Design a protein around this ligand. Structure first.
Ligand code: B12
Ligand SMILES: CC(C)CC(=O)SCCNC(=O)CCNC(=O)[C@H](O)C(C)(C)COP(=O)(O)OP(=O)(O)OC[C@H]1O[C@@H](n2cnc3c(N)ncnc32)[C@H](O)[C@@H]1OP(=O)(O)O
Ligand SMILES: CC(C)CC(=O)SCCNC(=O)CCNC(=O)[C@H](O)C(C)(C)COP(=O)(O)OP(=O)(O)OC[C@H]1O[C@@H](n2cnc3c(N)ncnc32)[C@H](O)[C@@H]1OP(=O)(O)O
Ligand SMILES: Nc1nc2c(ncn2[C@@H]2O[C@H](COP(=O)(O)OP(=O)(O)O)[C@@H](O)[C@H]2O)c(=O)[nH]1
Ligand SMILES: C[C@H]1O[C@@H](n2cnc3c(N)ncnc32)[C@H](O)[C@@H]1O
Ligand SMILES: [Mg+2]
Ligand SMILES: [Mg+2]
Lengths: 157, 1061, 232
């Protein structure tokens, strides 16, 4: 419950922070230069947590990752490419992981904290990034140890 | 290298069969392997196929029979072939799961070469079957050729057909050839050559001209037809697609042979083939060439009279000076005179022919240039050209009786009928623009709403810190005006909207909450929890709640309390048996929602008869309904005028006739109800009140979508234009009598989909067809709010991802266009549709698996808030749903609707990132297809080219290539097969007693109205001639006439459908 | 840690999920009080749930994952591997009936679907009473193969995400579990509750309630209390 209370508060801050800077850019586009807005915005940069600030920061980079046809991620000294697209008979590109199209950074942070993509905290949509491709266990158990063993050897041939 | 010999095939679908998806991909592989294929298309009797195969002198016959009655059909064909010198012709068949193994062994034992099961297709492959089929027929037919002309000259048409196969292959003796030309010279018979640009209408005009010859001379003339089509030298074979357009050649005095160019627009042995016909004592020989260029004219030296056929589209008027054929043609036919610029096209051609002949002392209007419309039944233009050809053939030594046809004057057709005016030609493109324009507004208004909120948000935060700046408010108030009136109210009603769907009821009161066993409150309609007013407005404009524009999540607020969307397709045997099946399905349901399936015979407007062609098909793929008395029996016990009873009849070609039967039935039920509640017949005034009331409140749906018949189902029996004419008559009848509960047309795409079209093509074509009807009625003078609420839709739900959002896309595209483009009211913007699970997605192998697929398909249908749902049985591939089989199908809906937890929410799709993205994609994909059809001249213009049919058959092949391939996994079919390889399943066939019953009921009905029969039918034809309302007469016609009588009567005055490959 | 038997015994999805997570946390507290480190046994902890027809089952898995991840990180301060709750889902056997056994494949399909949608780690599918025939196990095994390979929506690995219903249900079920945590806590923990037979009692109470509404005709079961076989 405490975690969710934080999601609410940090979202409000992230929302307000965006709203201010948004209004700041619109004033300068009309001529008026009021840095009084920026003071309230910079005030909320500190109000936001360290973790929360990085979440929104990685969001545009996160979008570009799940956008393409592949997912490039370098572990150790090599890399691990994963396909994102499965194409239908009609020719439609069905993305493995579909990202939200929110403009409000309040909604972005809220979603990133409550339901991040599969393979990211709090792992709501799964504990792994993408599903494994291709696992059917072989169950057996009857009679004495000899009969159960043979079935094991037979199924697992 | 292809086959060793010139291998020829005759391909067709069985009698009253529309299933061409199978046979069309077979004639494609046949053609690619190097076989000349004389394709006859769908709906072909045995007497048709055999006659064709005998005149073409082919080695093989390929027939698809999916309607059943295939045992009797093929037996008839085998018998008829042997009886008339065609025993050496091999017959091949296929009907998927319909033709069970036992019947295959029986038919193959009878004489049939091979009948391929779906399991054969898997093992052998698509190409494997055709390879096997072709290698069997790889024989030399020149051995059966006559050695002397004795047989041919005597009048033997089979010997003639074989002599031609000898002459074409050059295996005929030189002394015989010269002897043939010698007698051909002394024969002195006229040879009419018909040439012209590709697809101009040479075949269609030829057929019409022959029909004129038959009507005028009382079928006294012996006409020989030699049609030539271009041959792809790459494959080796060709697609001889001229015979398929011929409807008037079905007569003993008519003979036709299809030749491939095998190179030039003329066969290398054309003079030999012509001479062979001349010696066979034919009264007239007609020759059709292929698609000739501007400077092509090779038909001229071989014929005695030449006819150049062209369309009004020839570019500039200077082009006519380049056309060599305009210099030799004795007659010039400007066909397709219904097209734009036909009038000016005639003046240019007429003046050009006048110049070429140097007849300056004559009038341009006197030149043998005719404006024809072969697509039009009894076209006066074609008749004018015929009268001209008669006068020319008469002077060239051809005895003919004084004609019985209207010897009219003029050179130009007066066909002033138009379905969609050329001004509105690009209607689909405009609609695409309308939708895209709407979305552009959603984007802009959202940006404004977002900015407006951001400003006032910052304004409140500044005043909370001290520093007050009214400079922000100025920019905010600036965007209050920037926002539209409608958009501003949308956001304004949002907090009030939230409070509505928040509570436990919807205040007239509706419950919002359904509580689980755990005690969780599942809201019927779940609203978003966005803070950004940019997202709120965006969502309110793109996907408002169910029951609000653009009705993306449904056209109604909440789903019906008692009346579930369930509507089970049914029909088997006679009207008595089906009436039981209705009561079986509608048992335990307070709301009776019936869906009627008719047998192949009724679907094609024919009466049941003793001939094995027809008899074996009676009541075997649906209920056999032939008379009004049958229709009455079919719905006995069901109050059709009851508010909680709706009947959905699936009928296309004879739909106006069947509808008239249904209407009369619904009327008579209330007349009987009155006669019972009052113990007396109602007075003339009382009946009039009753009859009128019935028409207003009668609830149900008739399919009748003819645009999809040409494109998809192939149940169009009359000419396409005539069917559309009568369809409009039905809608006009509806408006006049305030029939505001019955749906005049179920604009469908299911059939288009099952033929092979992917979900995008299905949805696009169907909406396109729907909009075509709209444009058609608008040009016809009906208020958009008068016919749009009567428009029903029908879709298919398969496994493809797009099917999940097919319904919602259809709703939005309709709502937006109906509001912005056509400016219609709320009722019109609401697209209601029926979804039936994909039958093609179910297979014969491992039939238990089909219930899994039918479940998933039924799920996304209910999720996406469909209006009506049909669920397919597990034995889908093999038979019409059995008693046990229909319950499993009916249970799928009951389990999802009642037991399934997620289903307790009525908008579970909404919010989903995948759903919204897919919705946007599919929508745009449809809009792009709209544009593709628009640049082909609209839906009608596209059908003229066979665009839809082409695109469907292409996609059907692509799917099928992958199903057998393995790239597209099908569990139990191409992967995860059974180690066993699988018993005897119960089948839904019709009883022998039921067939004899229908025959006896028919002859009893006919005897009852024997006096008023001919008189009523005469009135019906006069209704078409005088151009009145056809359906209005049908309301009286179905009381004294049978289905077959009416259909055949209309044939004399409304014509027959011209197949389109 | 299993909860299959708890649900099968009659417990509704909330009770099942709550008790199971509670049992899991009990093992955690048990191992911690032996002076052990949290990152040494938490990644070894496997879970085992049931998927029935109830709406809550659609979001059972995702709720289990979030409650675990948040607690393992904030409360116990464990690493990433520990915050990841892996679980097996087996379709509800209770939900399948002896009457009209062909209907069970429909229910087993729907249950298998929401399991895969909600990205489960392991799935068992129940057959359509009698002995586990090699034919009956193939129909069960085909349900997974058809969804995984043929089903179109399944090509997307997070189709649940975004849905208004799913997010609301996720929040509700989560809180419902938390409240049950508190109920068990004020009974002396899981062990303290078992001492009173709280869980057993509550399961028994809910099993009766289900079995009641079933007979009541209030909870429709196709082929059982409605749409019954007209032959027998
Ligand atoms: C698609 C389809 C349609 C489409 C047809 C599209 C078209 N333009 O062709 C539509 C939706 C229009 C349709 C309509 C109807 N249909 Co339908 N349709 C089907 C369906 C789903 C598949 C048939 C198909 O095209 N399969 C694709 C082909 C390529 O594959 P296949 O059949 O498995 O065939 C293989 C081999 O056998 C081989 N083979 C087959 N034919 C041939 C031919 C040759 C020459 C060769 C060499 C090989 C060969 O090739 C394939 C290799 O894999 C079947 C059910 C099923 N799944 O079997 C019902 C089915 C055939 N239809 C049926 C019925 C009843 C109808 C209707 C009459 C319903 C009604 N009462 O109104 C209507 C009207 C038809 C008409 N207008 O004449 C019933 C038949 C019942 C019976 N005969 O006892 C079926 C079995 C469905 C059912 N269970 O009720 N239909
Ligand atoms: O043994 P297992 O089969 O359970 O897995 C072995 C290791 O692989 C991991 N794994 C399994 N499925 C996926 C997946 N879909 N995405 C990413 N990682 C995955 C699994 O966590 C395990 O890794 P370790 O914990 O041993 O490092
Ligand atoms: C042959 C082979 C190839 C296979 C095939 O092709 S099988 C083809 C079979 N075809 C079919 O099954 C087509 C069935 N479709 C239809 O009958 C129509 O298209 C439908 C519109 C779906 C009929 O739906 P239906 O149940 O009759 O509902 P209606 O729209 O006519 O409702 C009548 C009036 O009742 C009210 N109502 C109905 N539902 C709701 C609601 N949820 N909330 C509020 N009010 C409601 C409402 O007043 C409505 O009338 P209006 O005021 O909208 O005019
Ligand atoms: N709009 C229109 N189409 C026609 C007319 N006559 C024939 N057609 C169509 O033109 C197409 C091709 O006809 P076809 O006889 O095969 O021409 P051919 O291949 O050159 O002999 C078909 O779709 C016909 O229905 C006409 O008078 N008007
Ligand atoms: C084209 C589709 O029509 C359906 N279909 C055809 N005839 C019937 C019938 N009598 N009952 C139910 N469904 C039928 C099949 O499910 C097929 O897939
Ligand atoms: Mg032609
Ligand atoms: Mg031609």
């Amino acid at each position: 419950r405490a975690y969710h209370r934080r999601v609410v508060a940090q979202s409000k801050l992230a929302r307000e922070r965006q709203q201010l800077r948004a209004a700041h850019d619109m004033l300068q586009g009309a001529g008026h230069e009021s840095a009084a807005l920026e003071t309230l915005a910079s005030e909320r940069d500190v109000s936001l947590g360290a973790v929360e600030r990085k979440l929104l920061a990685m969001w545009p980079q996160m979008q570009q990752a799940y956008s393409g046809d592949e997912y490039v991620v370098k572990i150790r000294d090599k890399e691990i490419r994963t396909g994102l697209i499965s194409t239908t008979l009609s020719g439609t590109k069905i993305r493995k992981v579909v990202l939200p199209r929110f403009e409000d950074e309040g909604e972005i942070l809220k979603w990133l904290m409550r339901e991040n993509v599969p393979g990211s905290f709090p792992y709501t949509a799964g504990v792994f990034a993408f599903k494994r491709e291709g696992p059917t266990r072989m169950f057996a158990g009857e009679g004495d140890a000899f009969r159960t063993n043979r079935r094991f050897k037979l199924v697992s041939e | 290298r292809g086959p060793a010999n010139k291998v020829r095939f005759v391909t067709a679908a069985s009698l009253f069969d529309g299933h061409d998806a199978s046979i069309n991909i077979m004639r494609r592989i046949l053609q690619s392997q190097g076989c000349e294929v004389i394709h006859l298309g769908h709906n072909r009797s045995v007497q048709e196929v055999v006659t064709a195969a005998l005149q073409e002198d082919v080695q093989g016959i390929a027939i698809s029979s999916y309607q059943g009655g295939h045992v009797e059909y093929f037996k008839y064909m085998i018998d008829l072939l042997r009886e008339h010198g065609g025993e050496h012709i091999q017959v091949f068949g296929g009907g998927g799961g319909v033709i069970v193994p036992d019947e295959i062994r029986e038919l193959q034992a009878y004489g049939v070469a091979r009948i391929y099961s779906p399991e054969d297709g898997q093992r052998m492959g698509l190409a494997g079957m055709i390879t096997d089929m072709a290698q069997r027929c790889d024989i030399d037919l020149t051995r059966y050729a006559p050695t002397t002309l004795d047989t041919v000259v005597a009048g033997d048409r089979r010997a003639l057909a074989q002599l031609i196969t000898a002459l074409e292959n050059g295996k005929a003796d030189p002394e015989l050839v010269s002897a043939l030309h010698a007698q051909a010279k002394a024969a002195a018979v006229p040879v009419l050559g018909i040439t012209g640009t590709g697809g101009a209408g040479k075949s269609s005009l030829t057929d019409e001209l022959i029909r004129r010859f038959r009507l005028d001379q009382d079928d006294a003339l012996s006409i020989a037809v030699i049609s030539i089509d271009p041959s792809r030298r790459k494959s080796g074979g060709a697609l001889l697609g001229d015979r398929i357009r011929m409807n008037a050649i079905n007569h003993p005095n008519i003979f036709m042979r299809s030749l491939a160019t095998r190179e030039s627009e003329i066969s290398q042995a054309l003079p030999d083939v012509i001479a062979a016909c001349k010696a066979a004592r034919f009264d007239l020989v007609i020759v059709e060439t292929s698609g000739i260029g501007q400077g092509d004219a090779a038909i001229v030296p071989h014929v005695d009279l030449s006819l150049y056929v062209m369309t009004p589209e020839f570019g500039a008027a200077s082009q006519l000076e380049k056309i060599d054929m305009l210099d030799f043609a004795d007659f010039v036919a400007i066909n397709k005179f219904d097209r734009k610029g036909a009038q000016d096209a005639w003046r240019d051609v007429a003046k050009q022919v006048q110049r070429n002949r140097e007849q300056w002392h004559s009038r341009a209007e006197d030149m043998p240039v005719y404006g024809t419309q072969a697509s039009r039944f009894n076209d006066d233009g074609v008749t004018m050209l015929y009268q001209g050809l008669v006068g020319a053939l008469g002077a060239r030594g051809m005895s003919l009786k004084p004609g019985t046809l209207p010897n009219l004057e003029g050179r130009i057709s007066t066909g002033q009928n138009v379905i969609v005016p050329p001004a509105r030609s690009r209607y689909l493109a405009e609609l695409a623009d309308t939708v895209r324009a709407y979305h552009r507004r959603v984007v802009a208004q959202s940006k404004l709403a977002r900015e407006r909120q951001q400003l006032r948000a910052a304004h409140d935060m500044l005043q909370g810190a001290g520093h007050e700046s009214a400079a922000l408010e100025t920019l905010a108030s600036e965007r209050d005006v920037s926002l539209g009136a409608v958009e501003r109210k949308l956001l304004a009603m949002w907090p009030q909207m939230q409070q509505a769907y928040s509570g436990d009821e919807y205040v007239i009161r509706t419950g919002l909450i359904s509580t689980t066993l755990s005690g969780t409150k599942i809201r019927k309609v779940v609203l978003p929890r966005f803070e950004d007013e940019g997202e709120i407005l965006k969502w309110l404009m793109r996907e408002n709640v169910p029951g609000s524009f653009p009705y993306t999540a449904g056209v109604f607020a909440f789903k019906r309390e008692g009346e579930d969307p369930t509507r089970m397709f049914a029909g088997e045997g006679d009207a008595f048996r089906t009436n039981r099946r209705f009561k079986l399905v509608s048992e335990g349901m307070e709301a009776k929602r019936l869906s009627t399936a008719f047998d192949s015979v009724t679907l094609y407007g024919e009466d049941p008869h003793e001939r094995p062609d027809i008899y074996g098909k009676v009541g075997n793929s649906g209920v056999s309904i032939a008379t009004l008395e049958d229709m009455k029996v079919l719905y006995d016990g069901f109050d059709l005028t009851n508010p909680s009873t709706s009947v959905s009849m699936t009928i296309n070609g004879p739909a106006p006739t069947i509808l008239a039967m249904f209407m009369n039935t619904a009327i008579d039920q209330q007349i009987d109800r009155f006669r019972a509640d009052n113990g007396r017949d109602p007075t003339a005034d009382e009946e009039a009140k009753i009859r009128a009331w019935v028409l207003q409140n009668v609830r149900g749906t008739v399919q009748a979508d003819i645009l999809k018949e040409d494109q998809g189902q192939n149940t169009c029996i009359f000419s396409t234009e005539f069917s559309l004419k009568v369809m409009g008559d039905i809608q006009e009848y509806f408006v006049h009598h305030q029939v505001r509960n019955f749906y005049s047309v179920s604009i469908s795409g299911y059939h288009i989909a099952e033929a092979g079209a992917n979900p995008i093509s299905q949805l696009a074509f169907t909406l396109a067809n729907g909009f075509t009807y709209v444009e058609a009625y608008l040009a016809r003078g009906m208020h958009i709010d008068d016919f749009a609420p009567n428009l029903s839709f029908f879709f298919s739900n398969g496994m493809d991802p797009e099917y999940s959002v097919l319904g919602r896309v259809a709703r939005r595209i309709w709502a937006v266009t109906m509001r912005d483009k056509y400016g219609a009211n709320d009722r019109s913007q609401k697209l209601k549709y029926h979804i039936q699970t994909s039958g093609r997605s179910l297979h014969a192998q491992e039939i238990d698996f089909n219930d899994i697929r039918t479940t998933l398909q039924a799920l996304i249908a209910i999720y996406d808030n469909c209006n009506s749902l049909h669920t397919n049985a597990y034995d889908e591939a093999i038979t019409t749903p059995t008693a046990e089989s229909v319950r499993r199908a009916l249970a799928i809906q009951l389990i999802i609707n009642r037991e399934w937890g997620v289903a307790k929410c009525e908008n579970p799709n909404q919010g989903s990132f995948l759903i919204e993205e897919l919705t946007d994609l599919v929508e745009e994909a449809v809009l792009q297809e709209f544009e593709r059809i628009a640049e082909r001249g609209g839906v009608l213009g596209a059908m003229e080219t066979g665009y839809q049919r082409g695109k469907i058959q292409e996609e059907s092949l692509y799917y099928e290539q992958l199903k057998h391939d393995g790239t597209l996994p099908i569990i139990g079919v191409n992967t995860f097969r059974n180690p066993n390889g699988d018993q005897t399943l119960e089948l839904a066939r019709s009883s022998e007693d039921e067939k004899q019953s229908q025959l006896h009921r028919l002859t009893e009905f006919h005897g009852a109205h024997q006096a008023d029969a001919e008189a009523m039918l005469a009135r019906l034809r006069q209704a078409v001639i005088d151009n009145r309302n056809v359906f209005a007469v049908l309301m009286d016609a179905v009381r004294v006439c049978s289905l077959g009588q009416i259909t055949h009567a209309l044939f004399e005055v409304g014509g027959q459908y011209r197949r389109n490959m």
